[PDB]
Amino acid sequence: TKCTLKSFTVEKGIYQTSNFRVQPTESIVRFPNITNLCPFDEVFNATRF
Amino acid sequence: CTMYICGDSTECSNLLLQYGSFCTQLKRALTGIAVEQDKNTQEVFAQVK
């Protein structure tokens, strides 16, 4: 409170300072089962385009 | 602002403090309105001891 109000002697009363926010437990990455290597790498092997 | 302007992003919040006190004013201005509504009800009704 004395930080956000920027002093050392805060007066009597209520003061809005910050907010309470919980934090995530873990990380989730979900992708479709398919992981078929992509055939556009064969374009790099090609000579005549 | 920390939740509305930026989606709780540490990268966006750094840019918000770069703008200075454009959000301390709005928090203060809205706080003045909030305490004002509670005062407005006092004169209308709280006229009897």
Side-chain angles (χ1 to χ4, degrees):
Chain A
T1 53
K2 65 180 64 157
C3 193
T4 60
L5 192 149
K6 278 199 51 166
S7 80
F8 279 170
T9 45
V10 293
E11 273 293 276
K12 180 210 289 171
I14 197 183
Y15 300 97
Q16 166 81 256
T17 57
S18 63
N19 49 3
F20 165 73
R21 171 141 179 83
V22 288
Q23 289 272 17
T25 73
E26 277 83 58
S27 308
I28 282 188
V29 170
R30 293 296 301 274
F31 288 149
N33 321 42
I34 76 97
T35 36
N36 18 356
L37 199 151
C38 282
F40 82 109
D41 68 323
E42 301 172 352
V43 188
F44 205 90
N45 282 9
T47 289
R48 165 73 264 156
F49 269 18
Chain B
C1 294
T2 305
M3 271 268 288
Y4 168 67
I5 276 166
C6 301
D8 59 272
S9 297
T10 175
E11 293 82 3
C12 182
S13 179
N14 287 331
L15 277 296
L16 190 45
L17 61 83
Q18 215 268 344
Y19 275 71
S21 61
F22 291 167
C23 280
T24 310
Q25 295 183 21
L26 319 174
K27 191 173 74 39
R28 187 183 301 127
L30 279 180
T31 313
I33 304 308
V35 72
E36 192 66 330
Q37 306 314 288
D38 285 328
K39 186 140 64 172
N40 281 352
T41 312
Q42 288 293 121
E43 291 94 9
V44 174
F45 294 118
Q47 295 271 259
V48 287
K49 314 152 291 313

